Amino acid sequence: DPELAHDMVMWLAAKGYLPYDLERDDPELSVNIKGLTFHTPVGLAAGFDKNAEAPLNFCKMGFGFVEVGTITPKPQLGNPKPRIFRLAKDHAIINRCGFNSAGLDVVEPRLEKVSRDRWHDRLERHCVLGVNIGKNKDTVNAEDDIREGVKRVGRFADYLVINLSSPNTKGLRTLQQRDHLRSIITAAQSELEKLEERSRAEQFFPTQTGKRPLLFVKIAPDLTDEEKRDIADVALETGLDGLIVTNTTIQRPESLRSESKHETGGLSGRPLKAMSTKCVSDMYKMTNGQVAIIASGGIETGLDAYKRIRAGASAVEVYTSMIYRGPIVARRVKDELLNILNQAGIYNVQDAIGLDHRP
Ligand SMILES: Cc1cc2nc3c(=O)[nH]c(=O)nc-3n(C[C@H](O)[C@H](O)[C@H](O)COP(=O)(O)O)c2cc1C
Ligand SMILES: O=C(O)c1cc(=O)[nH]c(=O)[nH]1
């Protein structure tokens, strides 16, 4: 069952008993991305550590970054169980958590905690922190709820991710329209424009940098081409930092086996690879690679990753892999990714970005 596989791995992570990394990762993997130094391009995807529980553990376990939940502002319970199925036969997961956070009241000090204690012991080669934020199912003006995730938990972020594509929350995937998208992105970056004083990183608004998280938008793979062109023609113009370029898909492709394949939810995993990998490409090269890209959806192998890294992502989030291959999907993908850099010719990762569109 994925539900408690997700939860015991999170528990074993929370007290930290899971196996750690060691070899200190070769610098070929170093990826600078609009001023954020990521050690590893592999990270954890925006659904595993929901309520900011144990980011730094999974981090020390070989992910160069994690991305905390989606944090709504008021606590939610989401949808009744059973809400998330394995589709074993084609390495896939339908899910329908319909958001289910503890809230910005609860996670604010959980980051305050992680923000202070991340600098101290082990003298870290800082593993990067992404904060993912969203709306209470039935919120009136969604422009009002994104505004709180910034005001609250956004100063703790190495990168804030406005979630606008969970197929399971009440008309949330419909916010990605030129007029709505632009409003939410502006309103968010109006809030990051709350820069304030001190004595007038450990102390201060602390993020492997002065502050002001590199902002991000999460979009569904189920976009039109009509509208990917809008979304893009917005992003450059809004000066959006980057796009996390794959939530789950609502789609249910033919050639799918495990009998649960008909279930209402967000399909993740293998059949989100081709889906997702093409929808990186159309955003890197519909934005001159100017708008940074972190991609997820079916990334389970260095070859999967490099394949997609080339395509235009400077980083790679994992979850459905992480349930099948285990927690060592981080180090196993790192290793395969590295070998594919030597064999190919251009070592490193930064070099390989945009290589499908390189002039
Ligand atoms: C059980 C589950 C919960 C998820 N929760 C979230 C979430 O809260 N916020 C979010 O932005 N994405 C969420 N996602 C989407 C994943 O973060 C990821 O983008 C998607 O699964 C595709 O990646 P993968 O197929 O490589 O795991 C979730 C996915 C799954 C399977
Ligand atoms: O609410 C959910 O269940 C959900 C959110 C999300 O962002 N992605 C997903 O697959 N499910």
Author numbering: 18 to 217, 244 to 402
What is the paper's account of this structure, in its own sentences?
Based on localization and electron acceptor, DHODHs are classified into two families: Family 1 members are soluble proteins localized to the cytosol, while family 2 members are membrane proteins localized to the inner mitochondrial membrane. Family 2 DHODH enzymes use respiratory quinones as electron acceptors. Amongst the 6 enzymes of the de novo pathway, DHODH is the rate-limiting step and the key enzyme connecting pyrimidine biosynthesis to ETC at the level of ubiquinone.
The crystal structures of inhibitor-free EtDHODH and EtDHODH-ferulenol complex were determined at resolutions of 3.5 Å and 3.65 Å, respectively. The fact that; (i) there are no significant intermolecular interactions in either crystal structure, (ii) EtDHODH migrates at similar sizes with PfDHODH and HsDHODH, i.e., around 45 kDa, in high-resolution clear native electrophoresis using dodeylmaltoside buffer (micelle size of 72 kDa) and visualized by CBB and DHODH activity staining collectively suggest that EtDHODH is functionally monomeric, consistent with other family 2 DHODHs such as those from human and P. falciparum. The small N-terminal domain is the enzyme’s membrane binding region, which forms two N-terminal amphiphilic helixes (αA and αB). The large domain has an α/β-barrel fold with a central barrel of eight parallel β strands (β1–β8) surrounded by eight α helices (α1–α8). The large domain of EtDHODH contains additional antiparallel β strands (βC, βD, and βE) at the top of the barrel. The N-terminal extension found in DHODHs from other apicomplexan parasites, such as P. falciparum, T. gondii, and Neospora caninum, is not conserved in EtDHODH.
